[PDB]
Amino acid sequence: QSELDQLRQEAEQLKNQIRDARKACADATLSQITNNIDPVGRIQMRTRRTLRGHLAKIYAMHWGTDSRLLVSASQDGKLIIWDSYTTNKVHAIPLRSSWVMTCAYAPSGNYVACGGLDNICSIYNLKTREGNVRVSRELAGHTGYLSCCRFLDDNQIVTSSGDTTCALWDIETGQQTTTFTGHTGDVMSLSLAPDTRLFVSGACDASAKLWDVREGMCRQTFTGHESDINAICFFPNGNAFATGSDDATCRLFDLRADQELMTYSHDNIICGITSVSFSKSGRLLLAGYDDFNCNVWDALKADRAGVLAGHDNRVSCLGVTDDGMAVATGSWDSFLKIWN
Amino acid sequence: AVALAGALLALEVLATVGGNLLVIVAIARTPRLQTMTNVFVTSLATADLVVGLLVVPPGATLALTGRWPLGATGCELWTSVDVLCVTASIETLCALAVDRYLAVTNPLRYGALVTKRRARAAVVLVWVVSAAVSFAPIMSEAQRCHSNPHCCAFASNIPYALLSSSVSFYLPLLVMLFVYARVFLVATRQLRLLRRELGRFPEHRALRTLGLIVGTFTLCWLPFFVANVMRALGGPSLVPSPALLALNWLGYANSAFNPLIYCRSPDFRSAFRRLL
Amino acid sequence: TEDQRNEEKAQREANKKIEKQLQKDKQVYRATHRLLLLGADNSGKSTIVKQSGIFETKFQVDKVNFHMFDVGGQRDERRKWIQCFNDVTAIIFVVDSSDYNRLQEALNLFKSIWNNRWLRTISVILFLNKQDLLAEKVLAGKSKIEDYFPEFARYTTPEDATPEPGEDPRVTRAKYFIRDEFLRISTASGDGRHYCYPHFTCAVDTENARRIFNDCRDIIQRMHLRQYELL
Amino acid sequence: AQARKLVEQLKMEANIDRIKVSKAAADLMAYCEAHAKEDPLLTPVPASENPF
Amino acid sequence: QVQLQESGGGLVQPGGSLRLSCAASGFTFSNYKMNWVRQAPGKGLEWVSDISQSGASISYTGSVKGRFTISRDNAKNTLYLQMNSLKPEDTAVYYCARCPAPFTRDCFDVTSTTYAYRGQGTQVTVSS
Ligand SMILES: CC(C)NC[C@H](O)c1ccc(O)c(O)c1
């Protein structure tokens, strides 16, 4: 009763102190400091490749570390690995559950993970002695739809599921090494830092959290959006990240400054972002939208520079290669474009 | 009048080739439009394009000036390609009608009934039978133009004329009328049910569309084929050759008008806007 | 370069065999219809199912394979995992017409499903699963519907209603009042692309599959008619 | 205990050192300008080296 | 950060009136459709009334129809619910939940047990 009210008052006072400390160090806006740099111009990307082998809407894809092979999951119960150079398809893995919401390609290229509404993260071995692709593990520790999964090693995948928790897994044993909790609502996406010692996670409560993999504790919390956060990604240097929400705006948060640097938004766009990604140099932030086409923002002046098109349905998944050569865009029309 | 006729010739040929090429490019270079009915649409566009490219100019030149500008071999080839590309267009129109009839009156099983392979096989069979009926004289005003006086008439025997007319026009027309009557009944039933359901708490489009399709296809081809049948039963007294040529020009006008009817849907309009 | 050429040759052979497999998978997949089946805890939707995160079920009627499924593994918040069902043939919404206290929540859920950007095309098959309990409750008369719906006091049974011969006209009035509430929520915004197909269902009805078959057939037939600019 | 957990988490989050947003901005400019010479999407590359 | 602060009253007599206010901050009020929900003691969360972005589409639940009035003031970024002729069943905790996505005619998953865009609530108690 009274103790709860006193605790709430103390928490509110501490939050006010945090806000005051945050605003004290807000010297000048990056829009102001960037007055001395020149605009990037007008990027004109064209559809270099069109991959068409999926029956239903493409909901996720992931590029390989070789910048040539990619994996794409579709809601028809299919997980196709494509060679982006020759348009050929190396593997076509039929999933147990049709409703798959994410997929991941191992950094070594040996295993491929997927997982959707079945609450389980399935892992498939590509380079088997028999030459076939078979299920090597089935991680079944989540109670809620599995929204994201990313490989940290060949045995240490990390998973985000729509039950306000993320789990650090150990594929060999098949059990959760560490469990991260603290999100108010369903968690939508996660992104790993280049050093992979810590990652960020965006959830459906207009908040993002920085998780230390080793410690397994909530390190930092960023709250700058107004609606559900649908996508998250790292800046290439790993000291900043970008979030894309359903209220038709993208934001850039810095782990050190604890502030939102850019609010990439326009008055003419009232469609939520579904996927974000950065370029190799960190100058171009690509972002899919509900308005059926992607946008390209300059990551320092917030001015839109270049617009992708040619997708019959909404853009769901977006990925830039490890060498920054091409960008692959999937959409709910079951076609995957490759631009460069 | 000849001066106006030449301008009409040029405009009709340009419209035919442009429309059919636009339709073919839109289907080929758009994965969205690659529907099972759109292979039939592509076959129709190809047939109409070949009509407007190879048949309409020589035919209208012969109609305007009563002298064939080519040889006997040229006349034979022109007649063969004319019969081929006129039979193919009407047969693929019948195929389109059957396709939409199946899609409407058997919707649950239509996904597994009409496949891409089956549709392409049907298109190939249509072209095969059209070629078979067109190239019959190749293997083979009474017997006058056959002596090559530099005239390319339609002096064909009564059996071949009747059979070619029946295969090219009469059977496709009967099938189209049947399937379109059934589809119209289904559409009006659904429209009346929708009117009843949507009006519990505070127009005829199927009629307009089906009437437009059947009316253009009939008003543009029925005159020529009934005239040809009457000439075959009788002779030059009943129907003059200039009248036959005018009705053939009307049929070529139908081939020109086809791609603006089966391609008016909003997806086609959006593709055309992006293309144009 | 011989090794490289052999590499592309093997890759193309693998692509060809995988393409054959994918053609087979397409011919299998396009011949089945997916249905998102949802309701409430007291709805009784599990009773309609006459066979982890999804309780799947296949049934077949007239050589047509319907692919129905319940979603019970997730939490109550459903604004993110429901978009995944924007391509189903129909949405089977089950609700009990006996507990008036939990009928406004069902109305709100139906309205939210109806006016959704990604579900704006999907039509809804509505099931009222507790007709016998509703009839018994109305016959008892201890609970009054007007306590939860003040507009029921001036409601008249529609002329188009077709009550089963031998039932209470009060029960008929209650049934068609609930059905008309759902129908007005439906037609308030549905601009001819998606439709609602209410039905009255008990817990012992053995004809709950032909109803879904007929409703799906009508849905896809209207879809084709609208596609051919022929509605 | 839930209020105690929330307040202690907020306290741990309220002890890190915050650098100037201008300093973070300068670091971002440094990284983008340093790595801008190896971005095929930013600066187009000739079709000879283009794999697509 | 999105926050919704509710200010109502305490104990009222049956048949009385009470005006609940809801101060919303952290988001563009005019773009979101506001809702009023309530949780009765020993009962789950239920929906009472809702107001559109402008206020042209008002709706109430049946049990509250004819007694409560909902109205939004976008200039001051606030929401109001006036309650008249209160019944003993009307005692509850009133939550001023806002809507997940803007520019949408249907507001979805509002009465959830755990919802992010919802206020701490105010207790309305009616008795003798
Ligand atoms: C002027 C002539 C050569 N045109 C013939 C006409 O196009 C035709 C087409 C199809 C037939 O079956 C037919 O008897 C006649």
PDB file of C-alpha atoms in Angstrom, chain A residues 147-310:
ATOM      1  CA  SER A 147      10.258 -13.661 -33.788  1.00  0.00           C
ATOM      2  CA  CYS A 148      14.031 -13.613 -34.319  1.00  0.00           C
ATOM      3  CA  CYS A 149      17.139 -15.773 -34.087  1.00  0.00           C
ATOM      4  CA  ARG A 150      20.792 -14.939 -34.748  1.00  0.00           C
ATOM      5  CA  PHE A 151      23.889 -17.129 -34.616  1.00  0.00           C
ATOM      6  CA  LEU A 152      26.685 -16.004 -32.305  1.00  0.00           C
ATOM      7  CA  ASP A 153      28.826 -19.103 -32.937  1.00  0.00           C
ATOM      8  CA  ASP A 154      28.249 -22.600 -34.299  1.00  0.00           C
ATOM      9  CA  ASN A 155      26.777 -23.628 -30.924  1.00  0.00           C
ATOM     10  CA  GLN A 156      25.636 -20.415 -29.183  1.00  0.00           C
ATOM     11  CA  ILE A 157      22.585 -19.066 -31.021  1.00  0.00           C
ATOM     12  CA  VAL A 158      20.525 -16.261 -29.447  1.00  0.00           C
ATOM     13  CA  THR A 159      16.741 -16.129 -29.791  1.00  0.00           C
ATOM     14  CA  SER A 160      13.965 -13.548 -29.429  1.00  0.00           C
ATOM     15  CA  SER A 161      10.397 -14.757 -28.912  1.00  0.00           C
ATOM     16  CA  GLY A 162       7.120 -12.905 -28.547  1.00  0.00           C
ATOM     17  CA  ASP A 163       6.828 -13.472 -24.799  1.00  0.00           C
ATOM     18  CA  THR A 164       8.918 -10.532 -23.481  1.00  0.00           C
ATOM     19  CA  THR A 165      12.122 -12.595 -23.183  1.00  0.00           C
ATOM     20  CA  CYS A 166      15.278 -13.473 -25.114  1.00  0.00           C
ATOM     21  CA  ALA A 167      17.260 -16.676 -24.588  1.00  0.00           C
ATOM     22  CA  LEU A 168      20.946 -17.408 -25.139  1.00  0.00           C
ATOM     23  CA  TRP A 169      21.045 -21.032 -26.266  1.00  0.00           C
ATOM     24  CA  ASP A 170      23.644 -23.814 -26.325  1.00  0.00           C
ATOM     25  CA  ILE A 171      22.943 -26.020 -29.334  1.00  0.00           C
ATOM     26  CA  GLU A 172      25.084 -28.959 -28.181  1.00  0.00           C
ATOM     27  CA  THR A 173      23.126 -29.485 -24.959  1.00  0.00           C
ATOM     28  CA  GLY A 174      19.965 -27.882 -26.341  1.00  0.00           C
ATOM     29  CA  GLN A 175      19.085 -25.818 -23.254  1.00  0.00           C
ATOM     30  CA  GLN A 176      19.022 -22.119 -22.425  1.00  0.00           C
ATOM     31  CA  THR A 177      22.413 -20.945 -21.186  1.00  0.00           C
ATOM     32  CA  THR A 178      21.024 -17.519 -20.246  1.00  0.00           C
ATOM     33  CA  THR A 179      17.589 -15.887 -20.269  1.00  0.00           C
ATOM     34  CA  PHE A 180      17.072 -12.133 -20.648  1.00  0.00           C
ATOM     35  CA  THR A 181      13.901 -10.599 -19.198  1.00  0.00           C
ATOM     36  CA  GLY A 182      12.634  -7.065 -18.731  1.00  0.00           C
ATOM     37  CA  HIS A 183      10.651  -6.208 -21.851  1.00  0.00           C
ATOM     38  CA  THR A 184       7.101  -5.031 -21.171  1.00  0.00           C
ATOM     39  CA  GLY A 185       5.585  -6.320 -24.423  1.00  0.00           C
ATOM     40  CA  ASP A 186       6.295  -8.778 -27.209  1.00  0.00           C
ATOM     41  CA  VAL A 187       9.886  -8.530 -28.413  1.00  0.00           C
ATOM     42  CA  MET A 188      10.210  -8.172 -32.182  1.00  0.00           C
ATOM     43  CA  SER A 189      13.862  -8.076 -33.214  1.00  0.00           C
ATOM     44  CA  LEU A 190      17.458  -8.283 -32.061  1.00  0.00           C
ATOM     45  CA  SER A 191      20.842  -7.356 -33.497  1.00  0.00           C
ATOM     46  CA  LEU A 192      24.340  -8.441 -32.474  1.00  0.00           C
ATOM     47  CA  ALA A 193      27.351  -6.165 -32.250  1.00  0.00           C
ATOM     48  CA  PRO A 194      30.370  -6.887 -34.477  1.00  0.00           C
ATOM     49  CA  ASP A 195      32.273  -8.057 -31.385  1.00  0.00           C
ATOM     50  CA  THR A 196      29.181 -10.128 -30.384  1.00  0.00           C
ATOM     51  CA  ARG A 197      29.837  -9.575 -26.662  1.00  0.00           C
ATOM     52  CA  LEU A 198      26.540  -7.673 -26.332  1.00  0.00           C
ATOM     53  CA  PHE A 199      23.442  -7.124 -28.447  1.00  0.00           C
ATOM     54  CA  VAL A 200      20.330  -4.941 -28.646  1.00  0.00           C
ATOM     55  CA  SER A 201      16.681  -5.957 -28.690  1.00  0.00           C
ATOM     56  CA  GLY A 202      13.572  -4.061 -29.786  1.00  0.00           C
ATOM     57  CA  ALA A 203      10.124  -4.961 -28.477  1.00  0.00           C
ATOM     58  CA  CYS A 204       6.469  -3.966 -28.821  1.00  0.00           C
ATOM     59  CA  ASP A 205       6.511  -1.375 -26.034  1.00  0.00           C
ATOM     60  CA  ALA A 206       8.271   1.554 -27.784  1.00  0.00           C
ATOM     61  CA  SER A 207      11.507   0.620 -26.009  1.00  0.00           C
ATOM     62  CA  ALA A 208      14.839  -0.996 -26.851  1.00  0.00           C
ATOM     63  CA  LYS A 209      17.275  -2.674 -24.477  1.00  0.00           C
ATOM     64  CA  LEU A 210      21.002  -3.418 -24.520  1.00  0.00           C
ATOM     65  CA  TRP A 211      21.779  -6.928 -23.263  1.00  0.00           C
ATOM     66  CA  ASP A 212      25.223  -8.095 -22.150  1.00  0.00           C
ATOM     67  CA  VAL A 213      25.575 -11.700 -23.312  1.00  0.00           C
ATOM     68  CA  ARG A 214      27.999 -12.766 -20.574  1.00  0.00           C
ATOM     69  CA  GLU A 215      26.309 -10.921 -17.699  1.00  0.00           C
ATOM     70  CA  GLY A 216      22.744 -11.674 -18.809  1.00  0.00           C
ATOM     71  CA  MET A 217      21.394  -8.429 -17.328  1.00  0.00           C
ATOM     72  CA  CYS A 218      19.669  -5.392 -18.811  1.00  0.00           C
ATOM     73  CA  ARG A 219      22.440  -2.845 -19.317  1.00  0.00           C
ATOM     74  CA  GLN A 220      20.774   0.188 -20.912  1.00  0.00           C
ATOM     75  CA  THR A 221      17.250   1.178 -21.956  1.00  0.00           C
ATOM     76  CA  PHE A 222      16.250   3.561 -24.757  1.00  0.00           C
ATOM     77  CA  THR A 223      12.703   4.947 -25.032  1.00  0.00           C
ATOM     78  CA  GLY A 224      12.179   7.399 -27.877  1.00  0.00           C
ATOM     79  CA  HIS A 225       9.473   5.897 -30.071  1.00  0.00           C
ATOM     80  CA  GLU A 226       5.681   6.154 -29.880  1.00  0.00           C
ATOM     81  CA  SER A 227       4.501   2.707 -31.023  1.00  0.00           C
ATOM     82  CA  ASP A 228       5.673  -0.869 -31.556  1.00  0.00           C
ATOM     83  CA  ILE A 229       9.307  -1.276 -32.624  1.00  0.00           C
ATOM     84  CA  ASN A 230       9.367  -3.598 -35.632  1.00  0.00           C
ATOM     85  CA  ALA A 231      13.042  -3.565 -36.640  1.00  0.00           C
ATOM     86  CA  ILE A 232      16.466  -2.916 -35.136  1.00  0.00           C
ATOM     87  CA  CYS A 233      19.991  -2.896 -36.542  1.00  0.00           C
ATOM     88  CA  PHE A 234      23.527  -1.853 -35.608  1.00  0.00           C
ATOM     89  CA  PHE A 235      25.614   0.899 -37.068  1.00  0.00           C
ATOM     90  CA  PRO A 236      28.722  -0.782 -38.549  1.00  0.00           C
ATOM     91  CA  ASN A 237      31.054   0.593 -35.855  1.00  0.00           C
ATOM     92  CA  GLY A 238      28.851  -0.920 -33.137  1.00  0.00           C
ATOM     93  CA  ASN A 239      28.540   2.194 -30.951  1.00  0.00           C
ATOM     94  CA  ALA A 240      25.078   3.123 -32.271  1.00  0.00           C
ATOM     95  CA  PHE A 241      21.956   1.451 -33.611  1.00  0.00           C
ATOM     96  CA  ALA A 242      18.797   2.284 -35.550  1.00  0.00           C
ATOM     97  CA  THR A 243      15.203   1.356 -34.721  1.00  0.00           C
ATOM     98  CA  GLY A 244      12.202   1.294 -37.035  1.00  0.00           C
ATOM     99  CA  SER A 245       8.728   1.403 -35.505  1.00  0.00           C
ATOM    100  CA  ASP A 246       5.105   1.161 -36.630  1.00  0.00           C
ATOM    101  CA  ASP A 247       4.421   4.897 -36.177  1.00  0.00           C
ATOM    102  CA  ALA A 248       6.169   5.697 -39.498  1.00  0.00           C
ATOM    103  CA  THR A 249       9.531   6.896 -38.213  1.00  0.00           C
ATOM    104  CA  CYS A 250      13.071   5.606 -37.754  1.00  0.00           C
ATOM    105  CA  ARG A 251      15.379   6.706 -34.956  1.00  0.00           C
ATOM    106  CA  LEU A 252      19.102   6.519 -34.239  1.00  0.00           C
ATOM    107  CA  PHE A 253      20.191   5.775 -30.664  1.00  0.00           C
ATOM    108  CA  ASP A 254      23.749   5.912 -29.318  1.00  0.00           C
ATOM    109  CA  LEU A 255      24.825   3.603 -26.498  1.00  0.00           C
ATOM    110  CA  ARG A 256      27.228   6.206 -25.091  1.00  0.00           C
ATOM    111  CA  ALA A 257      25.254   9.447 -25.454  1.00  0.00           C
ATOM    112  CA  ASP A 258      22.007   7.765 -24.282  1.00  0.00           C
ATOM    113  CA  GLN A 259      20.065   9.997 -26.685  1.00  0.00           C
ATOM    114  CA  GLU A 260      18.245   9.778 -30.007  1.00  0.00           C
ATOM    115  CA  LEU A 261      20.428  11.415 -32.655  1.00  0.00           C
ATOM    116  CA  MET A 262      18.236  11.370 -35.778  1.00  0.00           C
ATOM    117  CA  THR A 263      14.494  11.015 -36.273  1.00  0.00           C
ATOM    118  CA  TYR A 264      14.256   9.889 -39.911  1.00  0.00           C
ATOM    119  CA  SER A 265      10.647  10.797 -40.665  1.00  0.00           C
ATOM    120  CA  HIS A 266       8.623  12.666 -43.270  1.00  0.00           C
ATOM    121  CA  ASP A 267       5.161  14.202 -43.235  1.00  0.00           C
ATOM    122  CA  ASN A 268       4.086  12.301 -46.363  1.00  0.00           C
ATOM    123  CA  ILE A 269       4.856   8.846 -44.900  1.00  0.00           C
ATOM    124  CA  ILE A 270       2.290   7.461 -42.449  1.00  0.00           C
ATOM    125  CA  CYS A 271       3.292   3.813 -42.906  1.00  0.00           C
ATOM    126  CA  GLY A 272       5.242   1.832 -40.335  1.00  0.00           C
ATOM    127  CA  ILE A 273       8.722   0.478 -40.964  1.00  0.00           C
ATOM    128  CA  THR A 274       9.091  -3.299 -41.208  1.00  0.00           C
ATOM    129  CA  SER A 275      12.865  -3.718 -41.606  1.00  0.00           C
ATOM    130  CA  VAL A 276      15.988  -1.561 -41.353  1.00  0.00           C
ATOM    131  CA  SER A 277      19.595  -2.117 -42.358  1.00  0.00           C
ATOM    132  CA  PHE A 278      22.810  -0.137 -42.658  1.00  0.00           C
ATOM    133  CA  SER A 279      25.328   0.132 -45.465  1.00  0.00           C
ATOM    134  CA  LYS A 280      28.922  -1.023 -45.099  1.00  0.00           C
ATOM    135  CA  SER A 281      30.254   2.486 -44.441  1.00  0.00           C
ATOM    136  CA  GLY A 282      27.241   3.463 -42.330  1.00  0.00           C
ATOM    137  CA  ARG A 283      26.197   6.328 -44.613  1.00  0.00           C
ATOM    138  CA  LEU A 284      22.998   4.856 -46.093  1.00  0.00           C
ATOM    139  CA  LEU A 285      20.214   3.499 -43.871  1.00  0.00           C
ATOM    140  CA  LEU A 286      17.765   1.431 -45.902  1.00  0.00           C
ATOM    141  CA  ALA A 287      14.283   0.908 -44.484  1.00  0.00           C
ATOM    142  CA  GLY A 288      11.276  -0.964 -45.798  1.00  0.00           C
ATOM    143  CA  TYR A 289       7.800   0.459 -45.317  1.00  0.00           C
ATOM    144  CA  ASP A 290       4.138  -0.513 -45.418  1.00  0.00           C
ATOM    145  CA  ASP A 291       3.662   1.704 -48.496  1.00  0.00           C
ATOM    146  CA  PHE A 292       4.911  -1.225 -50.647  1.00  0.00           C
ATOM    147  CA  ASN A 293       8.384   0.230 -51.366  1.00  0.00           C
ATOM    148  CA  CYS A 294      11.683   0.816 -49.577  1.00  0.00           C
ATOM    149  CA  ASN A 295      13.363   4.104 -48.688  1.00  0.00           C
ATOM    150  CA  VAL A 296      17.031   5.083 -48.415  1.00  0.00           C
ATOM    151  CA  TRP A 297      18.001   7.719 -45.840  1.00  0.00           C
ATOM    152  CA  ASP A 298      21.307   9.518 -45.441  1.00  0.00           C
ATOM    153  CA  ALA A 299      22.531   8.472 -41.997  1.00  0.00           C
ATOM    154  CA  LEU A 300      23.892  11.948 -41.167  1.00  0.00           C
ATOM    155  CA  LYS A 301      21.509  14.547 -42.660  1.00  0.00           C
ATOM    156  CA  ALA A 302      18.238  12.529 -42.356  1.00  0.00           C
ATOM    157  CA  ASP A 303      17.385  13.527 -45.949  1.00  0.00           C
ATOM    158  CA  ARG A 304      15.903  10.790 -48.115  1.00  0.00           C
ATOM    159  CA  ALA A 305      18.222  10.000 -51.041  1.00  0.00           C
ATOM    160  CA  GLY A 306      16.968   7.276 -53.356  1.00  0.00           C
ATOM    161  CA  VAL A 307      13.837   5.131 -53.295  1.00  0.00           C
ATOM    162  CA  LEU A 308      13.422   1.467 -54.188  1.00  0.00           C
ATOM    163  CA  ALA A 309      10.259   0.170 -55.839  1.00  0.00           C
ATOM    164  CA  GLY A 310       8.914  -2.738 -57.869  1.00  0.00           C
TER     165      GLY A 310
END
